[PDB]
Structures are given as structure tokens and as C-alpha cells.
Structure 1
Amino acid sequence: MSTSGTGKMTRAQRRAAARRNRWTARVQPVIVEPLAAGQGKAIKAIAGYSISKWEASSDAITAKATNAMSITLPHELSSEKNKELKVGRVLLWLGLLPSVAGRIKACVAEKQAQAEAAFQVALAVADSSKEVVAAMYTDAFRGATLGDLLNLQIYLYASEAVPAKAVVVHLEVEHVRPTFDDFFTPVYR
């Protein structure tokens, strides 16, 4: 007997002896849940590490050309004491208008000599065609003058020429948390 092997009246049964047959391991069923917008995951930063983010408005891009923009930080972390601060894993993603002309991509590498050449070498690349319009520079830039980054632009290409402020781009960046966040200021100056 085995599965629902419960009937009525007699009914013998025999099998055969050999070297088994079925697969060695057995099955497990599953059910991929359908996820909606934003349900994703915004992994938390790490130890004593802050994640400073902010965006930069786009520049009128052309046909199939690709522009660049030395990225600069905000006044807060723009302190010589914080400039020489260390960074962690970091990502870039981009918010853009709904009515978009063609599909396009974007990345970031050391102040490239050749602007288009960037895409031939960057670790990750925010692609529009992809479901995830963003790139993860995990350990890619871990450790670096929180100023170093300045000399190092970001690259963006477009299939169809396009306007400026036509799209922003955020940069969630891991970096050691400063000390300002806490304590006030010396009353005695």
C-alpha cells in the first residue's frame, strides 16, 4: 500500500527487483510572488556609514551622443575634514519623464578621456531597457577620498536626441558617517 491504497475486497500486488530507477533527490514546489513597484529592496547602509544621496539635473543630450558631468558633492560633506573621508559601496539610479524618446543607459568611471569609452569599462550600468534602471558600485569604489570622486565624471547616452532637465539621477552613496550630525556648537567662540 501507499497512496490512497485503501479500497474494498481483496486485491494482491507485487513489484520487481532491480537497481532502483527514479532520480536520487526529490522535488520541492514553489510559488513566485508577484511584486509591485517599490516593494523591492533599499538595503540598509553599514556600520558607522551614512548614505548621502542627492540628484543632478540633466543636460540637453543629442542623437546617439553621450555627455558627462563632473559630479560634485553638497556643502555639508564639502569640508576638508570630511573631504578626506572614506566611501563604501555606492549606487546611481535615475528618475526621468514618462514620455521618453527611445531607450538609453548611463554609468560612471574615472574622469574618462573618451566619454563613450566609459560604457566599455564601468562595473555596472543603469539601463532603461532593463527592469532595474540603476547600477550598483558595490566595493567598486569602496574606500576613497570623499573628494577623490570629484575628479571622476558620470556618463549618459541617449538613442534619441533629448532636452535638458529631461531627467535627473540620484546617487545613493555609502561613506563614513561624520560627527556634525550629533553635538551642537561651542558657545564660547
Structure 2
Amino acid sequence: AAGQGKAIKAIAGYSISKWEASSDAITAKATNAMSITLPHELSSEKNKELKVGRVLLWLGLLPSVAGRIKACVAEKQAQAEAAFQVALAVADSSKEVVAAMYTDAFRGATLGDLLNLQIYLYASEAVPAKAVVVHLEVEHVRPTFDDFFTPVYR
């Protein structure tokens, strides 16, 4: 009566940018480490400084993909494997809900800082490239738009 019929809503002043990234082939027990790339509209300097709120990560797999997939967002790791030991949430294909909701892990940071983070992706068995799409949804402060025309009328 407030969850399965309604979606989770952004806070006042923020909006949600969503984008994806396709996986690269991954060998059994391996852990690839792709990086975050902001969508063009958010790459400006003015935007790369917008403050982040919550971050959600979920996975889209081909029905065929067998095995177990796990993924998460954490800072660059000396050892990929280890990301999963410190990540504050993990999207795991074997659970009921295959998603990772970072409630405060990056709250306060800003887009751009997200560029220094990484998405670690593990698979228990070999998985073809493009077989896993990683969806990322970032709640951040709503960007500002231009309110004035260039002043050409002297």
C-alpha cells in the first residue's frame, strides 16, 4: 500500500538521469571493471558539479545467460575481486531483486566524481560480450537552464 504499486520518487530539487553500458566478455570466476561515463548533456563543467543523492544499479541479462552475475559500484580497487567486500550494496542475479541501491554511498559527491568510480562485474561462468547490460540511475540536483537571450539589442 505504498511500494509495489508506486515507484520510488526523487527528492525535491533533484531529478533522475538514467543510462546504460554494455558488458565485455567475461571468463568464469573473473571480475571485469568497466568505468562510469556521464551522458553528454551532463559532461559540461557547470553540470559535473551537480550534487548526487541516491544511485541505483540493476542488471539486464539475456534469458540464456547461465551462472551467477554480481555487480557493484565502488572506488578504483587494487584488486577487482575485493570491491565486493566493501561495496555498500551488490546487484546479484541469484536474489529476488537483482539491484543495488546506494542510499548514501555517494550522497554529497557530485557527477564527475562518479568518473573516478568503477563498476565491478563478476560472473561464475563464461559470459559472451554484450550479454549483460548494466543500468545506472543517478539522482542528482536538477541542472539549470538559460533564462536570457544573448543581449544583441545593445
Task: Give the Å deviation of 1:107.
Answer: 0.7
Task: Give the Å deviation of 1:187.
Answer: 7.6
Task: Give the Å deviation of 1:108.
Answer: 1.0
Task: Give the TM-score taking structure 2 as reference length.
Answer: 0.90
Report if the CA contact (8 A) 1:91-1:172 is conserved: yes
1:118-144: CA deviation from partner (whole Å, max 9, x where unpaired) = 001100000111010000100111111
Mark the CA change 1:104 to 1:142 in structure 2 (over 3 Å): closer, same or farther. Answer: same
Report if the CA contact (8 A) 1:112-1:152 is conserved: no
Please state if 1:121 is matched with 2:97: no
**Equivalent position SS for 2:71:** strand
Task: Give the Å deviation of 1:181.
Answer: 8.7
Mark the CA change 1:58 to 1:37 in structure 2 (over 3 Å): closer, same or farther. Answer: farther
Measured in 2, the distance between the counterparts of 1:152 and 1:49 equals: 21
Mark the CA change 1:175 to 1:37 in structure 2 (over 3 Å): closer, same or farther. Answer: closer
Please state if 1:133 is matched with 2:101: no
Q: Return the match for 2:44 from 53, 73, 79.
A: 79
Mark the CA change 1:58 to 1:40 in structure 2 (over 3 Å): closer, same or farther. Answer: farther
Measured in 1, the distance between the counterparts of 2:123 and 2:46 equals: 38
Mark the CA change 1:74 to 1:114 in structure 2 (over 3 Å): closer, same or farther. Answer: same
Task: Give the TM-score taking structure 1 as reference length.
Answer: 0.74
**Equivalent position SS for 2:32:** strand
1:72-103: CA deviation from partner (whole Å, max 9, x where unpaired) = 10110111011111000111001110012211
1:45-85: CA deviation from partner (whole Å, max 9, x where unpaired) = 11110100011011101111010111110110111011111
Q: Structure with the greater relative contact order (CA < 8 A, sep ≥ 6): 1 or 2? A: 2
Structure with the greater alpha carbon radius of gyration: 1
1:108-165: CA deviation from partner (whole Å, max 9, x where unpaired) = 1011121110001100000111010000100111111210110111101001111110
By percentage of residues, which structure has more strand? 2
Report runs of 4+ in structure 1 exceeding 4 Å deviation. 36-41, 181-189
Task: Give the Å deviation of 1:180.
Answer: 2.9
